[PDB]
């Protein structure tokens, strides 16, 4: 501890060779509200990092004829109005490596958890171009979210951009966390980008991750609501850069942009402060470009680039149910599918509050395994018929027996779509659940018993008949032998449950 | 000091001061304008530098009024970000946006000051302790259990509550609290400020016999104050609470009046600060201006700040930008419905809108969680049955929906409760209802054994024994 400081001083004095280079420099004219108009940076390029006399670092965004409008990644309190702004020549990279797994970082790829510092050797530009047409494939691998109503009705594949759009406090963050926890068995690197959130919310989310063990394969990019607008606007792009590193190294990744609406509002704030012409809801005309340039990075690579992929799960919050709002329409146009959450469904008890009648997935059944499509067909047909007859539920007594049967079937298929928070189901468990419900081996129980019977049944199968799990896992198809094992387990569990 | 400037322009609250070529203030410094009083006498006006204008000019929003202020007045750059007295010298005294006493007592000890601006606590120094403190109100004990050490929010227009609610919470908790309390009245009325001050002197909180034995520090900038003072009174009170959380390491109880006023004061000055208008008329920096102050409010793992904030929802537009950007910062929101105030379900708390993060089974207990879920489902089913009732007839309804409607009307009546601070409005004495009695009462109601009491037997009663007593009294009035 005595000579190490001296040898570090010696190595750091022998490292540099006193090199000289022409720097592009300028002087601050006016600074205020996170923007600086600086005079002199003539060779500066659009999107380049400039460094201020007081240590603040900013981006040269709009290059006008008289000055350079610069957004500050910090507080411009100490900027002097005459201080020297020296351009760095670089465009906004981050150091990237595998040592980020388990870490919490801000939009500068620097740790905010105080667990040390990431050793990173490679580097990647924050704004990197998306994969082209010829460096892509068709999305065919499923991305299991653990939510049965998602994986059966709105299936997500690896390389697909699915929108988690809903009202406030309907369960968007919950769906995102259940998917990150369900990625436990799979080798999917997960990325959660917290944009403009409260710091205690990010604290709870990351401690929940560490508890359930989903922190060994996850990275958390956090830009809370006290951050400058520039950092909350840059954070999803650093998340995308990290996931792109892992994607091009033949790994499958998952990225959740929680409240991309906050990124749109931050970008609108800095656009308005740079005095740019606004549009609808004062959003700049390139806010669609902001969102699309980010979402097109989520690709499924081309089997000569490595078969890797990056699934993107952006989260968009609607206000007063206005799906026709500006940013929701933008992201709905950009993304592959949409997953709508309803506050009426959330209040009525059905959680997660997925509105399947209005949720789409343009990828379709190609994002499913072969064992899931068989049972998902019947689930889809029966839930559709229930949605038809739902207005007739108050007149059920004076109706045909087939109509009463379809009404009861739908109203107890709705009970198995309910699911507690942070409890994602494995694909075999949800396949067996859909099979039982859709065939009608629970058309005898009471609705206050369907969920409990199904929990006991899933535990019973997973413990007593592991051959069903093995058949559905290895062959990925709903084999007749699996059907036999499942019918035997259903009979035996019905007897054990009627034993009370 | 050495940095003496001159007023260049006066436009309402915004004034830009011309300073020497090299020497200039920083953003968020305090400038002191040597003004003249109404009579012939020197007056002081404090300003706050907002932006550097480029020609040795800096825009500053004034804390006081600028009527009577000439161009070319000397301006003293204090070189500080507008410090504020903190510590025990503040407990029991009404303060100002500038930290000066306005309770017509002696001066305050400037020995321990703190600047009005600050950065939020780091991410490593945050709590993850998920607790619940009991308030005594049925509708928030059973539906949106407020978190101990968290940020609570009160939404609603003008005339639904949030002020009677915040006074009821003050009544119920500010003396049962161990640490100090801090009230910040941002852009609210002066009559309500004087009433709260008299009631705190009465309740033995101010302890007027000796002030330093008190546990509250009132900071106040009302509607009559300029937009620059309503914009910084929140940071003043927040700094006073930061000191009690950090240096004294005691649990602080921070009550805020309308934080909508903190945002609309910024939106008022923002046009004069040259900033271009954002969505419907707020400043382009609404989200960051909210976020700085909100993230500064935090339980920092060495002390906790429980923050109860009233958020004015303008024109009952719950999707207005100002409340929309607050929802994301609060922990347990509590929406107030004008539809319940219109019939007298005070506290007119919207049961299906008021959510909370403590209403989780592992935090709250399975009995509490399940009874809250059942109440919410019954109210939602009744709200969805509303139009099949309101036109097609309540008589033709099925057997299960008639029981749903009856039990939901009984639940709606039972959510109301008479407050101790609102016996001037309800004309009846107030009642404190513990959590267990709330759980037991709602479990009785939706059990089906209280199906015999009239609906009005559940109106404005404390607990379920009061409901049964009122039912008995109603039956007696109906018979003889």
């Amino acid at each position: 501890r005595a000579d190490e400081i001296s040898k570090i001083i010696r190595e750091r004095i022998e490292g540099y060779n006193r090199e000289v280079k022409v720097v592009n420099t300028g002087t601050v004219l006016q600074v205020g509200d996170g923007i600086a108009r600086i005079h002199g940076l003539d060779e500066v390029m659009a999107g380049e990092l400039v460094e201020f006399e007081e240590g603040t670092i900013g981006i040269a965004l709009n290059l006008e004829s008289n000055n350079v409008g610069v957004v500050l990644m910090g507080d411009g309190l100490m900027i002097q109005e005459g201080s020297s702004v020296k351009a760095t020549g670089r465009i906004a990279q981050i150091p990237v490596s595998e040592a980020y797994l388990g870490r919490v970082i801000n939009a500068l790829a620097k740790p905010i958890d105080g667990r040390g510092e990431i050793t990173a050797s490679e580097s990647r530009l924050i704004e990197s171009p998306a994969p082209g047409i010829m460096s892509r494939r068709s999305v065919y691998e499923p991305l299991q979210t653990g939510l049965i109503a998602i994986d059966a009705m709105i299936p997500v594949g690896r390389g697909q951009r699915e929108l988690i759009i809903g009202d406030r406090q309907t369960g968007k963050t919950a769906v995102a966390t259940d998917t990150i926890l369900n990625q436990q068995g799979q080798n999917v690197i997960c990325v959660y980008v917290a944009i403009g959130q409260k710091a205690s919310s990010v604290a709870q989310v990351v401690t929940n991750f560490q508890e359930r063990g989903a922190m060994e394969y996850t990275i958390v990019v956090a830009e809370t609501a006290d951050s400058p607008a520039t950092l909350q606007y840059l954070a999803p792009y650093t998340g995308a850069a990290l996931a792109e590193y892992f994607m091009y190294r033949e790994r499958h990744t998952l990225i959740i942009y929680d409240d991309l609406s906050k990124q749109a509002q931050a970008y609108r704030q800095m656009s308005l402060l740079l005095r740019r012409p606004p549009g609808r809801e004062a959003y700049p005309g390139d806010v669609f470009y902001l969102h699309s340039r980010l979402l097109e990075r989520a690709a499924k690579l081309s089997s000569l680039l490595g078969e890797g992929s990056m699934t993107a799960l952006p989260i968009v919050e609607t206000q007063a149910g206005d799906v026709s709002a500006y940013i929701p329409t933008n992201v709905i146009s950009i993304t592959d599918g949409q997953i709508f959450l309803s506050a009426d469904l959330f209040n009525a008890g059905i959680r997660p509050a997925i509105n399947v009648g209005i949720s789409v997935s343009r990828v379709g059944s190609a994002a499913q395994i072969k064992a899931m499509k068989k049972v998902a067909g019947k689930l889809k047909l029966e839930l559709a018929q229930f949605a038809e007859l739902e207005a007739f539920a108050q007149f059920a007594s004076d109706l045909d027996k087939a109509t009463q049967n379809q009404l009861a079937r739908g109203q107890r298929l709705r009970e198995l779509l309910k699911q507690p928070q942070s409890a994602p189901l494995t694909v075999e468990e949800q396949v067996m659940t859909i099979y039982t419900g859709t065939n009608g081996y629970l058309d005898s129980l009471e609705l206050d018993q369907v969920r409990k019977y199904l929990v006991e049944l899933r535990t019973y199968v997973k413990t007593n008949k592991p051959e069903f799990q093995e058949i559905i896992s290895s062959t990925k198809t709903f084999t007749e032998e699996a059907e036999a094992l499942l019918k035997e387990a259903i009979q035996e569990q019905m007897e054990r449950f009627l034993l009370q | 000091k050495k940095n003496l400037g001159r007023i260049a322009q006066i436009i309402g609250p915004v004034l830009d001061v011309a300073f020497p070529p090299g020497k200039m203030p920083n953003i968020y410094n305090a400038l002191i304008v040597k003004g003249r009083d109404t009579a012939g006498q020197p007056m002081n006006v404090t300003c706050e530098v907002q932006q550097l204008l480029g020609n040795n000019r800096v825009r500053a929003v004034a804390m006081s009024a600028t009527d009577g202020l000439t161009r070319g007045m000397e301006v003293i750059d204090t070189g500080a970000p507008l410090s504020v007295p903190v510590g025990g010298a503040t407990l029991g005294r009404i303060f100002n946006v500038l930290g000066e006493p306005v309770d017509n007592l002696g001066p305050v000890d400037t020995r321990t000051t703190s600047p009005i601006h600050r950065s939020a606590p780091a991410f490593t120094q945050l709590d993850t302790k998920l607790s619940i403190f009991e308030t005594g109100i049925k509708v928030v004990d059973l539906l949106a259990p407020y978190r101990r050490g968290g940020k609570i929010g009160l939404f609603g227009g003008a005339g639904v509550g949030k002020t009677v609610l915040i006074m009821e919470l003050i009544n119920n908790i500010a003396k049962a609290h161990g640490g100090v309390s801090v009230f910040g009245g941002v852009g609210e009325r002066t009559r309500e400020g004087n009433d709260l001050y008299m009631e705190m002197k009465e309740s033995g909180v101010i302890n007027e016999q000796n002030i330093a034995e008190s546990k509250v520090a009132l900071v106040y900038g009302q509607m009559n104050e300029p937009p620059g003072a309503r914009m910084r009174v929140g940071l003043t009170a927040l700094t006073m609470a930061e000191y009690f959380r950090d240096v004294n390491e005691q649990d602080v109880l921070l009550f805020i009046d309308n934080i909508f006023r903190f945002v609309q004061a910024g939106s008022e000055v923002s046009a004069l600060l040259g900033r271009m208008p954002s969505a419907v008329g707020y400043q382009p920096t609404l989200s960051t201006e909210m976020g700085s102050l909100q993230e500064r409010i935090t339980s920092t793992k060495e002390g906790s700040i429980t923050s109860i904030q009233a958020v004015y929802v303008p024109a009952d537009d719950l999707t207005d930008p100002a409340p929309a950007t607050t929802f994301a910062h609060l922990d347990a929101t509590t929406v107030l419905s004008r539809g319940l105030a219109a019939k007298g379900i005070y506290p007119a708390v919207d049961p299906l809108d008021s959510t909370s993060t403590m209403l989780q089974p592992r935090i709250v207990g399975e009995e509490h969680y399940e009874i809250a879920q059942r109440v919410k489902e019954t109210l939602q089913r009744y709200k969805e049955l509303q139009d099949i009732i309101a036109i097609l007839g309540l008589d033709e309804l099925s057997e299960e929906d008639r029981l749903t409607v009856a039990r939901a009307r009984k639940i709606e009546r039972f959510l109301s409760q008479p407050f101790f601070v609102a016996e001037v409005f309800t004309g009846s004495p107030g009642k404190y209802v513990g959590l267990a009695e709330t759980i037991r009462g709602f479990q009785l109601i939706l059990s089906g054994e209280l199906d015999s009491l009239p609906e009005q037997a559940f109106y404005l009663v404390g607990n379920i024994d009061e409901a049964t007593a009122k039912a008995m009294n109603l039956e007696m009035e109906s018979k003889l």
Binding site: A320, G321, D322 | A315, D316, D317, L318, T319
Partner: peptide, 11 residues
């Protein structure tokens, strides 16, 4: 809140 109450009336 006028558009939302219109949407709810339509619903």
């Amino acid at each position: 809140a006028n558009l939302r109450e219109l949407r709810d009336r339509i619903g």
